[PDB]
Amino acid sequence: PDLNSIAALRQVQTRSISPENFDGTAGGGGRATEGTGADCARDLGPGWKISPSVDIKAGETFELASIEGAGKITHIWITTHTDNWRTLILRAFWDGADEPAVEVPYGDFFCNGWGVFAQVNSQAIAANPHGGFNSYWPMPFRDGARLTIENTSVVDVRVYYQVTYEIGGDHSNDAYFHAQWRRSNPLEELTPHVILEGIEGEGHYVGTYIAWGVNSNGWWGEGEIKFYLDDDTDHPTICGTGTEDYFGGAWNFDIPGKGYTEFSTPYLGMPQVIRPDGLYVSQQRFGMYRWHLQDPIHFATGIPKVDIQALGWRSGWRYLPLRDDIASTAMFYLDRPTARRPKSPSADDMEVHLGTAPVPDLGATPPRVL
Amino acid sequence: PDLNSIAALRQVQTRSISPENFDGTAGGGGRATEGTGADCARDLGPGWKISPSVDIKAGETFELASIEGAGKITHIWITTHTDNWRTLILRAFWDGADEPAVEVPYGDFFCNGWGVFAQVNSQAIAANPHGGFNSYWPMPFRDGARLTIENTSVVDVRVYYQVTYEIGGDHSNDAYFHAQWRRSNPLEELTPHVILEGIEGEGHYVGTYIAWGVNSNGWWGEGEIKFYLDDDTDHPTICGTGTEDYFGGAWNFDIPGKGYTEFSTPYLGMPQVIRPDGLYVSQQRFGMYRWHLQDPIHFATGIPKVDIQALGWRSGWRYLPLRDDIASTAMFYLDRPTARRPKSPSADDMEVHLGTAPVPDLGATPPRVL
Amino acid sequence: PDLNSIAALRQVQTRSISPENFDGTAGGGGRATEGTGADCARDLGPGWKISPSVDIKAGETFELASIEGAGKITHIWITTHTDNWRTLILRAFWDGADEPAVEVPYGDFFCNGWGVFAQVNSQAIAANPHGGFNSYWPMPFRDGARLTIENTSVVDVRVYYQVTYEIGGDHSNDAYFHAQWRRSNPLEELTPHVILEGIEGEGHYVGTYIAWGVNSNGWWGEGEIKFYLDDDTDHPTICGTGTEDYFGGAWNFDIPGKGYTEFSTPYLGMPQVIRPDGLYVSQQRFGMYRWHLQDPIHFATGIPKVDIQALGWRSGWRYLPLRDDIASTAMFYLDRPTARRPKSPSADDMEVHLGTAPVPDLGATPPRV
Amino acid sequence: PDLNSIAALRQVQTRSISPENFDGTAGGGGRATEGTGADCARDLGPGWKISPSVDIKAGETFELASIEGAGKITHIWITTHTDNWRTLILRAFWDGADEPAVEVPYGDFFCNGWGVFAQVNSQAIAANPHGGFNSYWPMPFRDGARLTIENTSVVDVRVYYQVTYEIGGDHSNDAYFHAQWRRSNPLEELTPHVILEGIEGEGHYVGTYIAWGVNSNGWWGEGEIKFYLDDDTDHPTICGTGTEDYFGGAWNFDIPGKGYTEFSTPYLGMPQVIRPDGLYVSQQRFGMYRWHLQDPIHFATGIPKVDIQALGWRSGWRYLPLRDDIASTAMFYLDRPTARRPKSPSADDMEVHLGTAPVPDLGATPPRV
């Protein structure tokens, strides 16, 4: 429900999967006698926070949640240290499918793909101090749900999480939640950055998060977003007017006398502006989201292409093709649990620089000395 | 309705009770010739802000709103000076019930339990400069409604209010809105702070505001929330992983280089961080809220217990049971107009220090000096 | 002697026990070839700071001093790191007794019960940069003395110390030095904090140090101190008028426009004000001492009770009973080497949070991790 | 006793007189059911700070302490709001005498004659935040003692106090404590300010506190102190070399690059420097004390005169006789309970401006409007 409909009596059950209730059973929480907090509770009884988190060994995948039957995820809360935001891969599989519908680097799913905490005050995503990541995207499913997180790094990783969902609804006409990630670094000359390609089915596009690192001086966001829907081949159905325009800003996000200004509204934001520090943090980077909740982009047959140009300015008032560092996360609902995906994100494609030192390992927490 | 459904035509009437229209009648507003504004308008006349507020004498209860028939409150606005935020009790009675379904200290109901204004940008609660307290919790009723505000303080109190409601909808399947408040100060050793106890009926839990003052050094919010629903006894169905975790945050609310950081999002917030001033304002305090609107916690026959652990840190990585000052406000919808309640809040249990002086009466507005 | 009487020739001997002369014997100092400094002097010979300190293993007790016969301790210097100020227990045993007359956490004995250095300029106690702890309380004894320090913590600790004493002169009529510790956290509703209880004998009360952490807003120091002496039962002989009053301050220690002001005088002080930093050091705390040296509180048959009220302010000009964090150290002289004392301090009720980080182990030196 | 002698056992009783124990009797404290704190304790039970203070109505005198028999006051603690430091007169009468031995404005007794708080860390006098006034001057008597506070102001005042004393000692060769006050505003030209005059008996001079407000530019402390003792007539036995000199400073109290510097040591101090604010607080004022404790100034048959010159500088390296505002408090011990005194201080001669506003009533707490 929502504020408007919260009062209606509904025959629904609410369940919640955490490290204190791995399977989310009724009456099954807080029973652990082993866990990451056991030694901490050694002078207290059982039931005093024995199992708040899990450790995922380097290279391994952990099953956050396994649900049987029909249901709908209504709220995901999760945290881990910033160092892992671009080493963990978050995946969701609906209805027993062998391929995931959601396959995203952890940080980007919460508009935090740079490993530097940015506050996000939106409706679908809340990202709160410090690295408290919340997803309210409804994720309904008809015949099972699997959520996993893969630690592609060389170090062991600690993760806290809480997956809340509903049982007892009819999801026969609910679509499946999908999310996909692509990174161009550096984008090829005069080539749009692909956001989505080759999606088949009925559904609607509902979200874009972009992490953009700029390699040219001047304004970098002239490029237009383009939605090729259904029958479209060589020209899109929805064509935009700029990068900041798409994300609801205008005129370079530039408030006279203040510069680039972070903002974060229910459907539109640029929650992140990273400014170089004159030493080893040398890349100017941006994070921007737009949710199409009141204005979804429906498609009856498919989405052949969603892409966005990367244009700035050069002398003589000419557009400048940008060789920039662009990562997109596209959110969409579909009447199937799988669709064409890009190649799985590798450790190497995902990597951003860890700290503020000259070497990632020197600014990791704690530093890595080998 | 909401933004998505606001265009639809509906056979519904809107009414609003205020000191300028005490009973809400149509054509009934602005007729006062006596009131708190009458002398202010002695050179004007009737119709020029004659009756904007009410004066509630010390000890006495004022009936904000009496409504007959079926209806639904859609928006409450109310204000009063900060000195009264923890001396007034807000109450709501549905369907002619002898007992209140809402029984809350005034400030807590708007996430402001400490008497120090804090901005709240949430969906259900908006608290604005300076002490503009707004509630958008829908409160449906089938056979009448009464709202009251009790002045438990030794001074007369001024209150402005605007209670907006609808007539003409079907509430036979709408739950009733409830809210309950409990404070433990200091929390007993090894004792979860009880948020909600013994609720019988069908319904769903939708909101927590906690006012927390900390009596140990170090981090204070390791403790987990536990929801015992339906048949639960010894173990909860939903077990949390931490106090900041439950409220959408992570890692102590601690942004590196900034410390505790206030935030306020549609469903999650720590709107308030009170820092000691090194003189008479010596208690470090927090206010936190979570609304379970997209993700309500349902129950079919009851809520035996909701509670939250108060755990900090001791040497040797040991949880420290905290003897802290913890006040909780719990919001839930129920299919009955009454339910098991804590003891009624009293002047002594609600009291927080007034102002910044060594004596509450010195810092009151105006100073009492009696 | 003192400044007034220092010129007099006296048939007295001065000795001094330190890690460089463990038994304090004439000509016994500086002989070590092993000790905590030996390797530091590997390129120098012996006699170059070979044994300046001792290491005390986790859990273990170390005998600082053992003196045979009659004497008087005249000055104790001692130091150790911040993290050990509320983990070490200092004890003194007089005349071969099995029960100690002094049983006090290390830091409280030098007005430093919070593990944060505060300068103390008093006559009996001098606490100097950084953690140079000095006691000049004279401690006479007739038939032996033992000083011990117990490491109740889980780590090993370094201690430097120097215990200076005198042999000669009659302690026929010199009382014994006693010191006892009690902490209420949180204090019971509307209940005085006990400072001293059930003491029997002849003597005089000479010292109070209190470490006070406040859990209510407003002014916390209205409570009066009360001395029940000799035949007293339900009412005291000496009844104070406030907490800051007892400690020689007034009007909340609050100098207008500057707030709480630390001071330290020969007999009266508030040497420590700890203000919260708005992050993990969230407790506002105080350190206060009064030495009754020119104005001893005598008793002839005992001290039934010494207590102090914990009172602040509530709405309506009402006292507010304070559920506060109060630790007291009482100093008194007694005509017996033993007295009835509280339950020994444990590691747990002594513990104060270490450092400024979210977990004590993260703020320890070095971090425990 | 003191630190050097604190350990000795002594057949002495300690008593303390306060608003909570008006007569100091054993088992007598904390019994009140009426008092200034009774309404404050209305929600608590008996014994919770019912009687911590006294209200002295405008114009009236209040008897702080009345003691019968032999005894010795060992410590006085007292406080009241700064507005009253120069409207209250503190008096002490020994052995039933009809005239006081101590007759001093309240603030001056504690080196605070200007109504602006100044820390004093001295041996005999401790003045602590904010207005905690402490005297450790021992005051022996042989046949009773009376301590009074006179409120010469037109408003009611609140006082908190604690008078601690001993019984048991033999005071038959203990002198009586005396203190006297004299103000010259403005001092007549080329006329020494009289500190003490015509004292008859055996004793010793033990203290000077001077409150000095300067009405000429340049350095104001050239003038030197003179003690006329015993058979002295036209010339003194002790002749000092300067005003800062007498108070233990040198070269104008002026540290290069810092100006006048406050300091408070066990016997010597300039605890107070008051700098004009450029508006209504326009008088540059100083507070200075010297205790002659280790160096008492002895007399066998009396003190004809103690005085001090007020000399500054004019052009041509000539002394400038100063028309200055000089109040002194002389402490001395005498073998008699009474001595020759100045006129009692009046409200008008004691008055100092209250606050910082144009009119004293506007700067009082609260304003008298």
Residue numbers in the entry:
A (entry chain L), B (entry chain K): 2 to 371
C (entry chain A), D (entry chain G): 2 to 370
List sentences quoted exactly from the publication behind this structure.
In this study, we identified four enzymes (two GH183 endo-d-arabinanases, GH172 exo-α-d-arabinofuranosidase, and GH116 exo-β-d-arabinofuranosidase) from Microbacterium arabinogalactanolyticum. These enzymes completely degraded the complex d-arabinan core structure of lipoarabinomannan and arabinogalactan in a concerted manner. Furthermore, through biochemical characterization using synthetic substrates and X-ray crystallography, we elucidated the mechanisms of substrate recognition and anomer-retaining hydrolysis for the α- and β-d-arabinofuranosidic bonds in both endo- and exo-mode reactions. We propose a d-arabinan-degrading pathway for Mi. arabinogalactanolyticum based on its gene cluster and four characterized enzymes.
ExoMA1 had an optimal pH of 5.5 and was specific for the α-d-Araf bond. The crystal structure of ExoMA1 was determined at 2.42 Å resolution in the apo form. ExoMA1 assembles four trimers to form a dodecamer. ExoMA1 monomer has a double jelly-roll fold, which was found only in GH172 among over 160 GH families. The active site is located at the interface between the two subunits of the basal trimer. One phosphate molecule per monomer was bound to the interface of ExoMA1, which is responsible for dodecamer assembly. Other GH172 members (αFFase1 and a hypothetical protein BACUNI_000161 from Bacteroides uniformis) had been shown to form distinct quaternary structures depending on the mode of contact of the basal trimer. The dodecameric structure of ExoMA1 is formed by the interactions of four loops above the double jelly-roll fold, whereas the C-terminal helix is mainly involved in the hexamer (dimer of trimers) interactions in αFFase1 and BACUNI_000161. The corresponding residue in ExoMA1 is Asn253, and its side chain blocks α-d-Fruf binding, making the enzyme specific for α-d-Araf. ExoMA1 has a unique dodecameric structure compared to the various quaternary structures of the GH172 enzymes. ExoMA1 hydrolyzed the terminal α-d-Araf structures of arabinooligosaccharides released by EndoMA1 and EndoMA2 but did not act on MsLAM, A22BβT, and A7Bβ.
